[PDB]
Amino acid sequence: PGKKVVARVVELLHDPARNAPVARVRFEDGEERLILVPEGVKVGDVVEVKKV
Amino acid sequence: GKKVVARVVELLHDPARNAPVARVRFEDGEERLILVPEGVKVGDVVEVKKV
């Protein structure tokens, strides 16, 4: 319905060639994607995908 | 700090998942598939934020 979409941060790496860190994240269904995440997010955090 | 946002380029309700899947474009031009909340449409912007 109006549920939330979250993903646990499995892996995190600061790449000089990017302007936000890159994270391997695991969504609810167990699928893992590489995405950008805000500075300050660390391995073991949970990020939320939200509509602005 | 600096917010992380991405444009929803494409979107698809797969019955094999419990949230719709989107192709999104991050500010670096990179396009990744992720889950987005029910309600977002093509052209919306999503934020990735730590809860």
Author numbering:
A (entry chain A): 4 to 55
B (entry chain B): 5 to 55
What do the authors say?
Here, we study fold transition between distinct β-barrels by protein engineering and structural biology technique. Here, we discover that the previously reconstructed ancient DPBB sequence could also adopt a β-barrel fold named Double-Zeta β-barrel (DZBB), as a metamorphic protein. The DZBB fold is not found in any modern protein, although its structure shares similarities with RIFT and OB. Furthermore, the reconstructed OB fold could also be converted to the four-stranded SH3 fold by a simple circular permutation. Thus, these ancient β-barrel folds (DPBB, RIFT, OB, and SH3) could be readily interconverted by a few feasible mutations through the missing-link fold, DZBB, indicating their significantly close evolutionary relationships.
To demonstrate the hypothesized interconversion between the DZBB-fold and the OB-fold, we created their chimeric proteins by combining the design-1 and OB proteins. In particular, the OB-domain of rL2 from M. kandleri exhibited a high similarity with design-1 (identity 25%). The sequence region surrounding β2-β3 of the OB-domain in rL2 was incorporated into the corresponding position of design-1, based on the superimposed structures. Through this process, we constructed six unique variations by modifying the positions and extents of insertion (design-6–11). Biochemical and crystallographic analyses revealed that two of the six chimera proteins, design-6 (tkoL2_v1) and design-9 (mkaL2_v1), adopt four-stranded OB-folds. The DZBB and OB fragments comprise approximately 40 and 60% of these chimeric proteins, respectively. Therefore, the monomeric OB-fold could be reconstructed by simply combining the DZBB and OB-fold protein segments, without optimizing the structural interfaces between both parts. In contrast, the reconstructed OB and SH3 proteins did not interact significantly with any oligonucleotides.
